[PDB]
Amino acid sequence: MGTVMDVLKGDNRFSMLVAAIQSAGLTETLNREGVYTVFAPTNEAFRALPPRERSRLLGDAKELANILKYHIGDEILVSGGIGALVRLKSLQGDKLEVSLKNNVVSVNKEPVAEPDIMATNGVVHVITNVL
Template sequence: MKLYKVIVALLIATTLLLSGCAEQNSEEDMVTEEMGADDMEAEEMNIVETAVAAGSFNTLVTAVQAAGLDETLSGEGPFTVFAPTDEAFAELPEGTLEGLLEDKEALTSVLTYHVVAGEAMSGDLSDMMVLETVQGEEVTIYITDGNVMVNDANVVQADIETSNGVIHVIDKVILPPSMTS
């Protein structure tokens, strides 16, 4: 009887432990699940195909297509893309996204501010590193206690390798300084 109680107690403890771990899914874990790694390796797809397959970058893909940048970001590269999620776009002030979609020049400026020529893996980044974007202005990388930020956006998943570069998922749309002053 004692052995039965010990086994039941172990089963209950294991169940509680596993359910506690499941509840601790971070945004990074959720984005990883959405990346569709089972369907096709991201390394075999280009940046645009990877973003489409992920399912969490619908707004970004729509904006990239509206700006006519989908061919460029599907091209040879390599590129580093700091990719805001759909949730990041939803956090923009009301009317901002709609205004950008109506102004191709401004939209292109914002989108290319999220792209750096070349492949910058997370191991290549350092605190206070300044990178020139394809748009022409610079972003600054901040690293504190293992947390990486691009300007004021958190990197929630790094190093998604594609056939023509790398994607780092960020939790905020970053705007070029020339548009915020």
């Protein structure tokens, strides 16, 4: 199948996300073993960012690590599995509010462009704005 890291490197729309993963040095982590629920922003999510905010995020190594670490859940959580509003400890420390409506999963009041994609070490949900 592949870890989270390679379902990511295999879609040519997470380009920014991976480099950013490398830069934060979160490659091994998402390529080693474990159980993570990854909400992955598409290039567009990053592309959507306003300039001063684009620079604060990406022009600062501590920024990214912090934010990138926040899109990464502690447990594995697919759609079927959301029976109530679920809170996921992000590897950053703060919670990710997950929930479900019309088969569309949501995270911090933002719709997932594509619910849960598997990987040998977690699952990823595609979204189009950074959390």
